[PDB]
From Swiss-Prot:
It is found in: Cytoplasm; Cell membrane. Homodimer (via SH3-domain). Interacts with PTPN22. Interacts with phosphorylated SIT1, PAG1, LIME1 and TGFB1I1; these interactions serve to recruit CSK to the membrane where it can phosphorylate and inhibit Src-family kinases. Interacts with SRCIN1. Interacts with RHOH. Interacts (via SH2 domain) with SCIMP; this interaction is dependent on phosphorylation of SCIMP 'Tyr-107'. Interacts (via SH2 domain) with PRAG1 (when phosphorylated at 'Tyr-391'); this interaction prevents translocation of CSK from the cytoplasm to the membrane leading to increased activity of CSK. Interacts with LRRK1. The chain holds residues 11 to 68 of 450 of the full protein. It comes from the Eukaryota. Residues 1-58 are annotated as: Interaction with PTPN22. It comes from Homo sapiens (Human). Expressed in lung and macrophages. Autophosphorylated. This is Tyrosine-protein kinase CSK.
Length: 58
């Protein structure tokens, strides 16, 4: 997985979203049908969909 850093706070929008905080380090675990959304995983192991825009590659 490729690590990312959250640029902003994200409160989910739907059941499948992965909420996170600015500064958080996430690992993109998969790409989705939509280019603006990725599936990632956080520190404690939770997974969900996040916006490609709120996150900074490496």
């Amino acid at each position: 997985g490729t690590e990312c850093i959250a640029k902003y706070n994200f409160h989910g929008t739907a059941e499948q979203d992965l909420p996170f905080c600015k500064g958080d380090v996430l690992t993109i675990v998969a790409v989705t049908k939509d280019p603006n959304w990725y599936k990632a995983k956080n520190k404690v192991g939770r997974e969900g969909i996040i916006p490609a825009n709120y996150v900074q590659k490496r």
